[PDB]
Amino acid sequence: TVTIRTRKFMTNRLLQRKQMVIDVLHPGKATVPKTEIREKLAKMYKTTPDVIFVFGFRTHFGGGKTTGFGMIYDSLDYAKKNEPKHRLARHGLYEKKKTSRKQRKERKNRMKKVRGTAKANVGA
Amino acid sequence: PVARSWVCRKTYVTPRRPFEKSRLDQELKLIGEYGLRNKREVWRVKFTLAKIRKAARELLTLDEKDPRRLFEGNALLRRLVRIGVLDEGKMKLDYILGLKIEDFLERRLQTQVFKLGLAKSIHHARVLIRQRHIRVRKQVVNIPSFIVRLDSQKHIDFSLRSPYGGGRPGRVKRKNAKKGQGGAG
Amino acid sequence: KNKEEAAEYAKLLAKRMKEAKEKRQEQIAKRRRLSSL
Amino acid sequence: ARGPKKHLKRVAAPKHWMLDKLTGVFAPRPSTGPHKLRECLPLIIFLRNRLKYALTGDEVKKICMQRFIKIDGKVRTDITYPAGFMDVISIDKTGENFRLIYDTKGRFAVHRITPEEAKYKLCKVRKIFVGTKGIPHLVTHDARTIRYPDPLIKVNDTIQIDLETGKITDFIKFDTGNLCMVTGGANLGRIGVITNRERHPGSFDVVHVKDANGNSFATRLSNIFVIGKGNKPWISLPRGKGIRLTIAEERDKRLAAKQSSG
RNA sequence: UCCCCUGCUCGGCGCCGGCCCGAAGCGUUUACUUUGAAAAAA
RNA sequence: UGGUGACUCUAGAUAACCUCGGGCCGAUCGCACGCCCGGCGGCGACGACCCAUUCGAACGUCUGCCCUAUCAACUUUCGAUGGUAGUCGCCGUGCCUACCAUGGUGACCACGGGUGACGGGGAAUCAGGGUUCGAUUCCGGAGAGGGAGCCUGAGAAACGGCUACCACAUCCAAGGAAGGCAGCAGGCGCGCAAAU
RNA sequence: AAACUGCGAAUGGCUCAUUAAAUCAGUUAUGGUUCCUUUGGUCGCUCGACUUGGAUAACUGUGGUAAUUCU
């Protein structure tokens, strides 16, 4: 029974994207997850639910209102180019290297330790 | 260098005399009459009215037919009318000095709930505000120091998610109904 | 570009010098008029 | 220090850049360009905070690598390129042009212009230089070196250049009774008519400009800018037409607009 | 409340060498009084 | 020719110079391709002696600094003051050399000393006048134990660059080798006093 | 990958020890100098090969010192 309204809707031909501030109405219920929001934005924009990106949902005090942002693309690759990688990882389409910064910095100093082709060998 | 604010100020002032009878009795009477928590709240209201009176005296010091005096006088007069402690007939700058602290305590949310007729006593009004049962224009308030406006006095009502205003029954009612159904079946 | 653009500055400088010379001629003609009257 | 300064803090920025106060520690220092550090508008703050096209500082450099923004008709890939006063910003994709004219307050404001207005740009000459074998040169306020003008060009008068060829079409003589633009200081963005000019030898000269409603003010000679012959301009004015109305009249028109809107 | 009790080389609200007005240039210097410019942000 | 309130300004002509530890006058690269009888072309990147602009930096003008007389006179052929001619410096100039005259500041507090003194935008308190603090996030200055010297580079007397000293200090087959947390965490010492 | 080359490492960060017309603050000048980069100009203006030379990296192999981002 939740409803979605639009605000500050504007398009970017030079970014091939559409930007708007969405308003979420969920009275008597907890905060709706982003997947249902994405599927509803896919419904009212007549779009496949893969280029639909939403972020930043802050809940008001009292329940019933939650202000968020939505991002609407045209195609998959044009969405994949001009996107932050963490939203792609949230959608599951990107994977980053899993190592921590301390061993990277220590391994960089171990490449500093020697010279030559063995610089790649000492870092394993 | 970090990116913070570092801006804050006090909202209350401690009086110079700590122990004398008359002002202690007057503050204690005001605390009892309007159901407030401690002396810091009435000192805060006195501090705000003192700053407003100081600004009004500074505007009345400057001579007539000046742009900044008329601009700030009309701005402060419009704000003080719209907060609900003045009348449109008394639309003058020299009547700001005649105000008292009880007029500022009239527009508090606790006494407005008590005088509207949504609670029995003013302490019942305060423990109704702190309880999150009412709303002001489709949005609940929890703080008893919610100053209201002249156009916002009519729109105050019970919240949707409250058994007093129609909604889901509370914990104790559901516990007693569960106890009754356990004793019946 | 250097040759052609120098050619239009040659034409413009010649026209402006001619205009200044005839203006000075009118000025000394007015000087002779006020000296003769 | 031991060399040139390279970073820039948030509150060290000029007020007309006019950002917030808590989103970071550093502000975008512009790259070196035709304008000064203080009175300029970078591309990053314009695209991020005026047209609201992009939200984040990587998106604007993605735009600049996508080659969609042109300043004075040439594609600029610099993200902190200083686009100052009297500049034309052309976007080839969406098809709109922007010209930076100061409004009634001391800040830059957007001004959507026609493409037929977007092929020219005004300049103010700083000094007249004679070249090697007697070449008359130009020193404009936008660092454009022009060779061989009309010989009537003086120190103070303004010129019109064509963006494609970089040559003078027509010029406006600096005389008493021409339309005025003020750039810098307190009086910034007021449209008036130049009335009196006084010479102070050994110091800065001061002019006196009378507005259309009868208001008069004085500015220095170095901060003057002529935009029109007589009272007829050569560009399109922004909203308000450069009056600097008082805050009481602004309050009156704001409350009238709010009462009419409801 | 407001107009009046500063003088000799060039030129435009206007006329038939004559009237007036306006200007590249000048008039004992100080303090003080009033206005205007510039005087970073927080 | 041109401009400034002001040139020994820019420009014009003449007679030479033009430094081999030496000014310029493209022995570079990518993409898409071509027309016309081997020659002839587009859109860029990198570099370049100069010229202006931009980020500056640097040296100067006028005015404004806490306490102290149990500090009343101070500086000077070991430059203090000025002149002239120069060295050097990126330029002005005792910045420094050679020669001259005896100058320059002060009872309107110079000079000397102290500071539990970084300066300022500021903060507390506040009828009006005032008193105290400002190590502290923004600006400017100074230093990386303390003085001294230097390379590279446009810009450093740089210290997460080098070199000499002393104080301190690591490893060591005793021959030598390697350093500066007033950066982020953390340890010792210190102290009423300050975090992963 | 490694390595030669050009660039940036003189920015940022911390502290207040020295310093009392010194620093700094407002107002000025460089018509008494320098200026990486960016922007714009100049780049057949001069009257006399359809592409030149030999060295070095990286690499291979042989080594020393107890030890260094040593060679």
From Swiss-Prot, chain B:
The modification Phosphoserine is found at S152, S162. Gene3D superfamilies: RNA-binding S4 domain. GO terms for biological process: ribosomal small subunit biogenesis; translation. It is found in: Cytoplasm; Nucleus, Nucleolus. The keyword Signal does not apply. Residues 161-185 are annotated as: Disordered. Keywords: Acetylation, Cytoplasm, Isopeptide bond, Nucleus, Phosphoprotein, Ribonucleoprotein, Ribosomal protein, RNA-binding, rRNA-binding, Ubl conjugation. InterPro entries: Ribosomal_uS4, Ribosomal_uS4_CS, Ribosomal_uS4_euk/arc, Ribosomal_uS4_N, S4_RNA-bd, S4_RNA-bd_sf. Residues 107-181 form the S4 RNA-binding domain. One of its GO terms (molecular function) is structural constituent of ribosome. It comes from the Eukaryota. There is a cross-link at K92, K138 (Glycyl lysine isopeptide (Lys-Gly) (interchain with G-Cter in SUMO2)). One of its GO terms (cellular component) is nucleolus. It holds the Pfam family S4. The modification N6-acetyllysine is found at K65, K115, K154. NCBIfam families: PRK04051.1, uS4_arch. Component of the small ribosomal subunit. Identified in a IGF2BP1-dependent mRNP granule complex containing untranslated mRNAs. Part of the small subunit (SSU) processome, composed of more than 70 proteins and the RNA chaperone small nucleolar RNA (snoRNA) U3. Component of the small ribosomal subunit. The ribosome is a large ribonucleoprotein complex responsible for the synthesis of proteins in the cell. Part of the small subunit (SSU) processome, first precursor of the small eukaryotic ribosomal subunit. During the assembly of the SSU processome in the nucleolus, many ribosome biogenesis factors, an RNA chaperone and ribosomal proteins associate with the nascent pre-rRNA and work in concert to generate RNA folding, modifications, rearrangements and cleavage as well as targeted degradation of pre-ribosomal RNA by the RNA exosome. Belongs to the universal ribosomal protein uS4 family. This is Small ribosomal subunit protein uS4. The gene is RPS9.
Swiss-Prot record, chain C:
The modification N6-acetyllysine is found at K11. The modification Phosphoserine is found at S35, S36. Residues 17-37 are annotated as: Disordered. Ribosomal protein S6 is the major substrate of protein kinases in eukaryote ribosomes. The phosphorylation is stimulated by growth factors, tumor promoting agents, and mitogens. It is dephosphorylated at growth arrest. Phosphorylated at Ser-35 and Ser-36 by RPS6KA1 and RPS6KA3; phosphorylation at these sites facilitates the assembly of the pre-initiation complex. It comes from the Eukaryota. Residues 17-29 have a biased composition (Basic and acidic residues). It is found in: Cytoplasm; Nucleus, Nucleolus. Component of the small ribosomal subunit. Part of the small subunit (SSU) processome, composed of more than 70 proteins and the RNA chaperone small nucleolar RNA (snoRNA) U3. Belongs to the eukaryotic ribosomal protein eS6 family. Component of the 40S small ribosomal subunit. Plays an important role in controlling cell growth and proliferation through the selective translation of particular classes of mRNA. Part of the small subunit (SSU) processome, first precursor of the small eukaryotic ribosomal subunit. This is Small ribosomal subunit protein eS6. It comes from Oryctolagus cuniculus (Rabbit).
Swiss-Prot record, chain D:
One of its GO terms (molecular function) is rRNA binding. This is Small ribosomal subunit protein eS4. Component of the small ribosomal subunit. Part of the small subunit (SSU) processome, composed of more than 70 proteins and the RNA chaperone small nucleolar RNA (snoRNA) U3. Identified in a IGF2BP1-dependent mRNP granule complex containing untranslated mRNAs. The keyword Nucleus applies. Residues 41-103 form the S4 RNA-binding domain. GO terms for biological process: translation. The keyword Transcription regulation does not apply. It comes from Oryctolagus cuniculus (Rabbit). It comes from the Eukaryota. Pfam families: 40S_S4_C, KOW, Ribosomal_S4e, RS4NT. Component of the small ribosomal subunit. The ribosome is a large ribonucleoprotein complex responsible for the synthesis of proteins in the cell. Part of the small subunit (SSU) processome, first precursor of the small eukaryotic ribosomal subunit. During the assembly of the SSU processome in the nucleolus, many ribosome biogenesis factors, an RNA chaperone and ribosomal proteins associate with the nascent pre-rRNA and work in concert to generate RNA folding, modifications, rearrangements and cleavage as well as targeted degradation of pre-ribosomal RNA by the RNA exosome. There is a cross-link at K229 (Glycyl lysine isopeptide (Lys-Gly) (interchain with G-Cter in SUMO2)). The modification N6-acetyllysine is found at K232. Keywords: Acetylation, Cytoplasm, Isopeptide bond, Nucleus, Ribonucleoprotein, Ribosomal protein, RNA-binding, rRNA-binding, Ubl conjugation. The gene is RPS4X. Belongs to the eukaryotic ribosomal protein eS4 family. Its main location: cytoplasm. It is found in: Cytoplasm; Nucleus, Nucleolus. One of its GO terms (cellular component) is cytosolic ribosome.
